[PDB]
Design a protein around this ligand. Structure first.
Ligand SMILES: [Cu+2]
Ligand SMILES: [Cu+2]
Ligand SMILES: [Zn+2]
Ligand SMILES: [Zn+2]
Lengths: 153, 153
């Protein structure tokens, strides 16, 4: 039962800790924690390809997509491996995250350890938009905070 | 080939970027970069077991030691996989790092991606310090900065 963890930081008020846990090699991954400092509403939430924070969140590259698919929401059969949808922040700027995902893994070719989790300025449109960008990034806007996903006990 | 990268951050002025490169599965890893804000002299340099920085460098756990050995220098036969010896800072407080190591790896069983790189307050005694602590940690003292090791382009 592997566990992983991510400490999310950036240049504004967004701060957070996100935990990952996967009981079996082909079980769902439970993703949970809290992000504070976010505007009330939806914020796109994705695993990005590189665990490179050398220029902040920009160096993480694009959404993690080892199967070369189009962007979607987490419950779409067409999506990037890293497409975890939107987190929702309350009026006190806190997003309490509690997700179960079928596509990300802590092993194999969907393995996300060593890559970057990113929280965005605006809502992810889940790939349902009337432009090609929607099918690439979900139009979620700037990267507000991020962290490298590491092995936890 | 694989690349990885680590951005070292702490509570004081120590900071830097360390690059990893591995040409072949289970071939040697080149480790290079620059660390500033270090007092002149030797500072222990290890991969710790967990990529957990939620409580900062404290949460990273002990030396990465999957083969259950005792602590040594990097050129010793008896060492932890994480044992990278010492880096040396100059009089301008800068440590230029260039290491090649054959025991750490960016894939397979000695994989350090998702783990934590740590640079320490003083010299690692290379497990020859003559007490039990030496055989555990090399007596290198507190952790000045660390970063989670992430996959790079
Ligand atoms: Cu994203
Ligand atoms: Cu150490
Ligand atoms: Zn996507
Ligand atoms: Zn050691």
């Amino acid at each position: 039962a592997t566990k992983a963890v991510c400490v999310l930081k950036g240049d504004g008020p967004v701060q957070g800790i996100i935990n990952f846990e996967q009981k079996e090699s082909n079980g769902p991954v439970k993703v949970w924690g809290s992000i504070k400092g976010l505007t009330e509403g939806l914020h796109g939430f994705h695993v990005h390809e590189f665990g490179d924070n050398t220029a902040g969140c920009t160096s993480a590259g694009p959404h993690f997509n080892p199967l070369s698919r189009k962007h979607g929401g987490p419950k779409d059969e067409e999506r990037h491996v890293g497409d975890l949808g939107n987190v929702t922040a309350d009026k006190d700027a806190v997003a309490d995250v509690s997700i179960e995902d079928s596509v990300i893994s802590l092993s194999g070719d969907h393995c996300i350890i060593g890559r970057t989790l990113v929280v965005h300025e605006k809502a992810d449109d889940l790939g349902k938009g009337g432009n090609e960008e929607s099918t690439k990034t979900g139009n979620a806007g700037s990267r507000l905070a991020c962290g490298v996903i590491g092995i936890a006990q």
